[PDB]
């Protein structure tokens, strides 16, 4: 994914961060706490996929 995310626009790259935050991260973080989630791997990969993007928006 990193290679495909490296070829993206700076303003477009925020939307994916805010999409990773709005849904996905928060939603799974609540959904896991409520007890409505067997698939606990999604908590991990999303947390890394944030970091990936938040590192990838440090180009200058």
């Amino acid at each position: 994914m990193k290679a495909k995310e490296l070829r993206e626009k700076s303003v477009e790259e925020l939307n994916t961060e805010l999409l990773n935050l709005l849904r996905e991260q928060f939603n799974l973080r609540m959904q896991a706490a409520s007890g409505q989630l067997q698939q606990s791997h999604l908590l991990k990969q999303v947390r890394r996929d944030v970091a990936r993007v938040k590192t990838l928006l440090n180009e200058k």
Binding site: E17, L18, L21, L22, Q25, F26, R29, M30, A33, S34
Partner: protein, 92 residues
């Protein structure tokens, strides 16, 4: 108004008797929040994420119960719970 970070406050919805009684019989929700998280930030977070009308947020810090097993002691982590009183437009 403070995008992104609002989402990094609200940890989980607390489940208990006192959490139940306050749902039906007083129109509030209990929830765990990040160790900082001011009463403005929690309200503003609930106003976006849960997207419901909020009267006021009360807040308190729970202490880490010292658990022990085998040999070594073990202090649990502290955390902040927030009694968020909703307005008349509610659901969860």
């Amino acid at each position: 108004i403070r995008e992104e970070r609002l989402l990094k406050v609200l940890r989980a919805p607390h489940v208990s008797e006192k959490a139940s009684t306050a749902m039906e019989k007083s129109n509030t929700i209990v929830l765990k929040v990040a160790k900082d998280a001011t009463k403005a930030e929690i309200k503003a977070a609930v106003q976006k994420l849960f997207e419901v009308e909020v009267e006021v947020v009360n807040t308190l810090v729970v202490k880490g119960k010292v658990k022990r097993h085998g040999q070594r002691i073990g202090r649990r982590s502290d955390w902040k719970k927030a009694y968020v009183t909703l307005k008349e437009g509610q659901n969860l």
